[PDB]
């Protein structure tokens, strides 16, 4: 029980000690993105909208959130509400309905200053499901990237280009043929900045 | 680390009651049509997804970059600043925001803000299944400010079609966004709006 009290006092002390206006060109930030696809729920061929349920893994790192575990009773990590810290504005670029959050919005902060954030989401996006009832199935795509940060402020990365399907709903109306998540850097002749996005491409068919 | 502190100092120092007849404002408006999702002929409503680009400028958000470690611009939640009350005049459902609401502010006091939206508005889609297609229109304008307080402009009459979803149930034949200035015989003020006129048919 003494052990319980020091654990609480140390976390509280750490949190107030630690407690950022977002990244800049002079202080840029790498955000790593990943998807864990759970279900394709609905494919509406009267409006060409498709509904996906997924986990969107996000990870970034700040020097201003580093501490020495030893100065705080070996606390190596803590949980804090996503609304108490800054989060990246990674958004679907072609959704048709506001994204619905399916889970608590809670971040983990580790002692090296990594912040990790895995909200569950339902997304409607532009998708033509023609072919879904054929052996070749349908293919759809949606790009994810920052809403207002160029690649000079937010370097957007992946760990793999393979969407996690270990959790895909085995009795979905839809079978997944493949699911990839591709980082694409792009310059435009008009403009000086690189623009980065992650392209989620899903090939699927009726089970 | 000096950059972080300069940015924070800037936001602190900067953080307006709106425009008035003495201190009017220009709001530039443009649309990027992404998709005509649905055209309901049982209720004569149409659903559009688009980005709506807004730009205005405030003297109260100007700064000398040299005074702030050469910061030329920053980003900030649209809630932290005044934004114009540009609204569709004939929607049939409240507008749905599809994106974060984050503006860019530049050292000259320019504010840029481009949220993504889905809108249902009044539209008879009769003829959308023919060659001539159907035509629908929707005015955008300030809710409470006249041409004396807010001068609404567009940079071009062409609606940006560069991200129009080719596999939409509907193809675009034409999309214009036109500034219109009316005087009503009752009243001295100029009333300004932007007409979003869209001509479309079944693909």
């Amino acid at each position: 029980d003494d052990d319980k009290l020091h654990s609480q006092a140390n976390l509280m002390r750490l949190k107030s000690d630690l407690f950022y206006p977002g990244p800049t060109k002079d202080d840029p930030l790498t955000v790593t993105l990943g998807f864990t696809l759970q279900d394709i729920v609905k494919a509406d061929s009267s409006t060409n909208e498709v509904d996906l349920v997924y986990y969107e893994q996000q990870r970034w790192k700040l020097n201003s959130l580093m501490w020495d575990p030893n100065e705080y009773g070996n606390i190596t990590d803590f949980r804090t509400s996503a609304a108490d810290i800054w989060t990246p504005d990674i958004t679907a670029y072609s959704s048709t309905r506001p994204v619905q959050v399916l889970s608590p919005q809670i971040a983990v902060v580790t002692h090296d200053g990594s912040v990790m954030f895995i909200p569950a989401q339902r997304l409607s996006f532009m998708c033509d499901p023609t072919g879904v009832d054929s052996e070749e199935g349908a293919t759809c795509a949606v790009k994810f990237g920052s809403w207002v940060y160029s690649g000079f402020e937010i370097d957007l990365k992946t760990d793999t280009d393979q969407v996690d399907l270990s959790s895909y709903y085995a009795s979905s109306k839809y079978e997944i043929l493949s699911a990839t998540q591709t980082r694409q850097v792009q310059h435009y002749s008009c403009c000086p900045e690189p623009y980065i996005d992650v392209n989620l491409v899903v090939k699927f068919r009726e089970r | 680390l000096h950059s972080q502190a300069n940015l924070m100092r800037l936001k602190s120092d900067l953080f307006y009651p709106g425009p008035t007849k003495d201190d009017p404002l220009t709001v530039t408006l443009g649309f990027t049509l992404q998709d005509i999702v649905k055209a309901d002929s049982s209720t004569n409503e149409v659903d559009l997804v688009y980005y709506e680009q807004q730009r205005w400028k405030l003297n109260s958000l100007m700064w000398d970059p040299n005074e702030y470690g050469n910061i030329t611009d920053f980003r900030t939640s649209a809630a932290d600043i005044w934004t114009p009350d540009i609204t569709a005049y004939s929607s049939t459902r409240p507008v749905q925001v599809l994106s974060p609401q984050i503006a860019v502010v530049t050292h000259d006091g320019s504010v840029m803000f481009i949220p993504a939206q889905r809108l249902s508005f009044m539209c008879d889609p009769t003829g959308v299944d023919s060659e001539e297609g159907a035509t629908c229109a929707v005015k955008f304008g300030s809710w409470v400010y006249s041409g004396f307080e807010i001068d609404l402009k567009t940079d071009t009459d062409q609606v940006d079609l560069s991200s129009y979803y080719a596999s939409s149930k509907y193809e675009i034949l034409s999309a214009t966004q036109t500034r219109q200035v009316q005087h009503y015989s009752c009243c001295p003020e100029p009333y300004i709006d932007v007409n979003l006129v869209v001509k479309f048919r079944e693909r």
């Binding site: 670029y93 920052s146 | 680009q53 940006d160």
Partner: peptide, 13 residues
């Protein structure tokens, strides 16, 4: 994109 890329469009469109 530029105008179809929101963090580009916000600056130059």
């Amino acid at each position: 994109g530029c105008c179809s890329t929101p963090p580009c469009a916000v600056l130059y469109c």
